[PDB]
Amino acid sequence: SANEDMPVEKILEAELAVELNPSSPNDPVTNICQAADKQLFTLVEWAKRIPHFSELPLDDQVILLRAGWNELLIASFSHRSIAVKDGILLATGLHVHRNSAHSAGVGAIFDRVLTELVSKMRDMQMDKTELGCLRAIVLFNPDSKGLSNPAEVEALREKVYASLEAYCKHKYPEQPGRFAKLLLRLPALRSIGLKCLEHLFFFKLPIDTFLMEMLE
Amino acid sequence: ILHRLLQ
């Protein structure tokens, strides 16, 4: 009963529940950071829907979300941009393509998101259940500084392993390395997630409410 | 604030 301890259906429910004049600027960076701020409000309610997250001590939830929020949002907007051709779809419903990202100076990290994340997710046809599980793996990171009882966090992450793999072997029986290929997207997610944080901090030289506090 | 959105 690997799905009895970490059900992939409730993880998918956590993902589904999180899905006049033009007063919107056009500088792509401000549009990207604005959408990131209002998705941080979305991610908090997502994490509490992930099984056993709110059962951890309150500060452990604070550290876990403040540790992987960048990876957690990069994951679900790149997976949101599967059908987008050479671009990403922000949570505000606005799109950002390559040239508008190139002229903004972020084309380097943009092309890596496009080729190492969304292109990998699309050509493998990653479904929302697998995306939610990979996010639950990123959330349950025992390496985050200050966690009391990191083994409790490591145990929850390992539970997602067993249930995600059980899901991959059940619904994708002809792809035995499917569970592994899903996990192998996390190296590209961690690296771009930190390269996005250096882009973010180098930009504080427009502001948002929740985003500025997540960068304290 | 992150600490308030959690009840």
Binding site: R112, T115, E116, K120, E158, Y161, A162, E165, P176, G177, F179, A180, K181, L183, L184, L186, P187, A188, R190, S191, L194 | -
Partner: protein
């Protein structure tokens, strides 16, 4: 239920990779350790004596890594431009993974292929610098995995033959070569440890830590260039360019 044996196609891939790793990386089990006394107590910016030896050993193991890479099935059949890109992008990952395998926790030391055993302080002064505690904390995380030669070589092969590398000319072809290595590792880890299946995803996730550590390695060669008396050895320059 599961078979105590391996598929003949999988067994000879594992045998091939195990032989490649052992022939290019002797285990700590068969190394006569020898120690030195250069900068054995206090941490300094850069011990030039240790840096020359460490840089020379790193040049030797890069050669061994390339010799390890050419024995992996299909690596020599990809374009040399892709082989150069794959080796360049994974060289620090392999070197760090290899030296972390030779970590003796009782003495807090690590042993190189020639037998040289340096303590944490000497490892720092040889050139590691700010990376020392991260590397030692990674080698510590490697001990409960109990990886043998086949698993260490397979994980090395998986880090090298990776399809999401930049400038790759045939990334899907590289992805196809990685698929049997992932399959070989999964069935090999879980059959040696039938009680704990989580050891396979737990072992793959250290690649994520490995690529995060090697990113800091690329941020150390930029500052090591300003502290060494001459230039980097030519092979190290070609790999980390």
């Amino acid at each position: 239920h599961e078979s105590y044996t391996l598929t003949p196609e999988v067994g000879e891939l594992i045998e091939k990779v195990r032989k490649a790793h052992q022939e290019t990386f002797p285990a700590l089990c068969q190394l006569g350790k020898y120690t030195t006394n250069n900068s054995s107590e206090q941490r300094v910016s850069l011990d030039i004596d240790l840096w020359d030896k460490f840089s020379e050993l790193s040049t030797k193991c890069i050669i061994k890594t390339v010799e390890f890479a050419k024995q992996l099935p299909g690596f020599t059949t990809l374009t040399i431009a892709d082989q150069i890109t794959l080796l360049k992008a994974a060289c620090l990952d392999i070197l760090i993974l290899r030296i972390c395998t030779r970590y003796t926790p009782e003495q807090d030391t690590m042993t190189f292929s020639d037998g040289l055993t340096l303590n944490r302080t000497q490892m720092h002064n040889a050139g590691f610098g700010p990376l020392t505690d991260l590397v030692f904390a990674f080698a510590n995380q490697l001990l409960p995995l109990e990886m043998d030669d086949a698993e260490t070589g397979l994980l090395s092969a998986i880090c090298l033959i990776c399809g999401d590398r930049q400038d790759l000319e045939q990334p899907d072809r590289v992805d196809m070569l990685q698929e049997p290595l992932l399959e070989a590792l999964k069935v090999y880890v879980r059959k040696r440890r039938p009680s704990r299946p989580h050891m396979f995803p737990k072992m793959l996730m250290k690649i994520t830590d490995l690529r995060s550590i090697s990113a800091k390695g690329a941020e150390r060669v930029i500052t090591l260039k300003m502290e060494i008396p001459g230039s980097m050895p030519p092979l190290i320059q070609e790999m980390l360019e």
